[PDB]
């Protein structure tokens, strides 16, 4: 890999510079280099890997949605034929996004998840595995679509089972996992009532545990709870 000659600490330092410079493709390549050194990631390093790839795939998903919408409009009645270009360019962006999700999944499989024994790391990586299968499912339309949805599902469900055994209901990783999985149920699995149940239950269980928190932990947990409530408002 092109980062093989760079020190682990210098890749971490440059990922944090690239974040300040709003250059997450660079940030994700430094963090990929850091994971490929083979050592476990600390909590802060785990956050840099997830912010980098989320911003890379977020730009791809936004572009794919604009191109899909133009392509679907082109495919209505009374719409003028414009040739293969919208389809081709949608496919080029899709293939690129698939390749970034495959890269993240490959890092988790080789071998971040197998080496993660603490609940905070293992839940974090399994949430990421669910998230990146979810972005694959967002563009899937072929014979493996069911299987991609099930792989997301499986990963999120293993993360939920560990989170509920090992973490308090206000833990921000547990809350962001529940937020994410609820959106998987609503948008991917066509299960809006499972989505709304999971967001309500997660919000109420976290509310009841706020009293145990410091001011700073309270602010971290309530920020995520407000996202659950905003989705519930958008779904009910």
């Amino acid at each position: 890999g092109a980062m093989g000659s760079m020190e682990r600490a210098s890749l971490i330092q440059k990922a944090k510079l690239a974040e300040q410079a709003e250059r997450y493709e660079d940030m994700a390549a430094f963090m990929k280099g850091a994971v490929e050194k083979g050592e476990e990631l600390s909590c802060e390093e785990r956050n840099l890997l997830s912010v980098a790839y989320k911003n890379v795939v977020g730009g791809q998903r936004a572009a794919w949605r604009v191109l899909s919408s133009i392509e679907q409009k082109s495919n209505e009645e009374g719409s003028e034929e414009k040739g293969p270009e919208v389809r081709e360019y949608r496919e080029k962006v899709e293939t690129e996004l698939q390749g970034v999700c495959d890269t993240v999944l490959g890092l988790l499989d080789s071998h971040l998840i197998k080496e993660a024994g603490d609940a905070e790391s293992r839940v974090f990586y399994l949430k990421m595995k669910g998230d990146y299968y979810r972005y694959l499912a967002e563009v899937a339309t072929g014979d493996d679509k069911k299987r991609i949805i099930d792989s997301a599902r499986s990963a999120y469900q293993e993360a939920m089972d560990i989170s509920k055994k090992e973490m308090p209901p206000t833990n921000p990783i547990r809350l962001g996992l529940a937020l994410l999985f609820s959106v998987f149920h609503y948008e991917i699995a066509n299960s809006p009532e499972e989505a709304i149940s999971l967001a309500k239950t997660t919000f109420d269980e976290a509310m009841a545990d706020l009293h145990t928190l410091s001011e700073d932990s309270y602010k971290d947990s309530t920020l995520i709870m407000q996202l659950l409530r905003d989705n519930l408002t958008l779904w009910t």
């Binding site: 937020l179 994410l180 959106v183 609503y186 989705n231 958008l234």
Partner: peptide
């Protein structure tokens, strides 16, 4: 729908 991280 909101998901994290941003």
């Amino acid at each position: 729908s909101h998901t994290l991280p941003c």
